[PDB]
Amino acid sequence: NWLFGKKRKEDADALATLKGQQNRLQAEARNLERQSDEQKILASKMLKAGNK
Amino acid sequence: GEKIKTVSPERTERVMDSVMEQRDQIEMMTEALSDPSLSEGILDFEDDAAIDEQL
Numbered sequence: 001n002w003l004f005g006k007k008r009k010e011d012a013d014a015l016a017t018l019k020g021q022q023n024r025l026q027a028e029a030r031n032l033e034r035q036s037d038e039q040k041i042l043a044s045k046m047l048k049a050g051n052k
Numbered sequence: 053g054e055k056i057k058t059v060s061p062e063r064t065e066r067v068m069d070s071v072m073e074q075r076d077q078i079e080m081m082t083e084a085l086s087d088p089s090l091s092e093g094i095l096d097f098e099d100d101a102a103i104d105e106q107l
Contacts, residue, residue, distance in 0.1 A: 002094050 096102060 002097065005097050
């Protein structure tokens with residue numbers, strides 16, 4: 001009876017937790033990619049400016 | 053000086069750190085056992101509407 005709704009709620013909560021954690025990981029990956037692109041452009045710029 | 057060397061301040065720091073850690077663990081253990089979700093167990097699917105009208 002009422003246990004079926006509880007099971008559905010538990011599965012939905014577990015999926016919500018997993019998706020939220022995946023959202024944090026995707027945000028961190030986006031930040032890392034931003035930093036890597038910035039770093040590549042900076043390296044090209046300072047090689048233009050003459051340092052190895 | 054003999055007393056200060058025996059019970060050094062680092063020893064007191066270690067003892068107080070252990071007391072703090074163990075107090076935290078007792079609190080977490082004794083609040084894990086007191087979660088109201090058990091005796092509550094099944095909650096209203098209507099989310100307190102029936103108990104609202106009963107009150």
